[PDB]
Design a protein around this ligand. Structure first.
Ligand SMILES: Nc1ncnc2c1ncn2[C@@H]1O[C@H](COP(=O)(O)OP(=O)(O)CP(=O)(O)O)[C@@H](O)[C@H]1O
Length: 205
């Protein structure tokens, strides 16, 4: 049926990506704290609307963050019970939105506070976001950071019912972040100190 609406990137978002990706960072580990942030924020926002209305939390009436390395697909996934996004929050907040502090965060850096979501693309060549808000259906956002992304209505297969799953497809050199030592440490590490619980799940072979 083609629920995919293919869009193109902000001109400045492109710059923002070019900064991140095309600068070798010793520690690209920044990205994880960056994602767990936006997740805490999402759990925080749903926890809020959950006072004014209790029909909200009913979806998954528990607030969690899951981290799944999967060596099959070489992906690292981040999963919360948080607010989620509508097609609008997808097409509007992810791709078309310059996060708070301007790219002059980094633009003046030619001459971390925080990078946010886009920090993901230093360890991954590709990323897919599967999300469920309450007022809207489940949508799927995907980009290779090649100056266009795609948003697709996903009414089929499995639903979270609420919240968001970010799955990043790691670059061939970046697979260290599929490791349990690497990650168990990083759980307990920067942004372990936080409101919600963090489960790391790994496959025993
Ligand atoms: N886990 C999540 N659940 C739902 N929406 C999310 C999300 N992570 C990001 N978003 C949406 O995408 C937007 C833009 O992403 P981005 O990470 O660039 O900014 P941010 O609002 O997370 C602050 P920062 O720049 O510090 O991360 C967010 O404002 C939010 O609307």
């Amino acid at each position: 049926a083609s629920e995919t609406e293919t869009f193109a990137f902000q001109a400045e978002i492109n710059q923002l990506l070019s900064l991140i990706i095309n600068t070798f960072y010793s520690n690209k580990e920044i990205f994880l704290r960056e994602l767990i942030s936006n997740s805490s924020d999402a759990l925080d926002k749903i926890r809020f609307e959950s006072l004014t209305d209790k029909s909200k939390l009913d979806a998954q009436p528990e607030l969690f963050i899951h981290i799944v390395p999967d060596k099959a697909s070489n992906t690292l996934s981040i999963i919360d019970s948080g607010v989620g996004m509508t097609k609008s929050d997808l097409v509007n907040n992810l791709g078309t939105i310059a996060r708070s502090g301007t790219k002059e965060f980094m633009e003046a850096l030619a001459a971390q506070f925080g990078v946010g979501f886009y920090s993901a693309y230093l360890v991954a060549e590709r990323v897919v976001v599967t999300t469920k808000h309450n007022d809207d259906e489940q949508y799927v956002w995907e980009s290779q950071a090649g100056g266009s992304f795609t948003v697709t209505r996903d009414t089929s297969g499995e639903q979270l019912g609420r919240g968001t799953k970010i799955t990043l497809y790691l670059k061939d050199d970046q697979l260290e972040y599929l490791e349990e030592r690497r990650l168990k440490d990083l759980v307990k590490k920067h942004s372990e100190f936080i409101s919600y619980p963090i489960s790391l799940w790994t496959e025993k072979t």
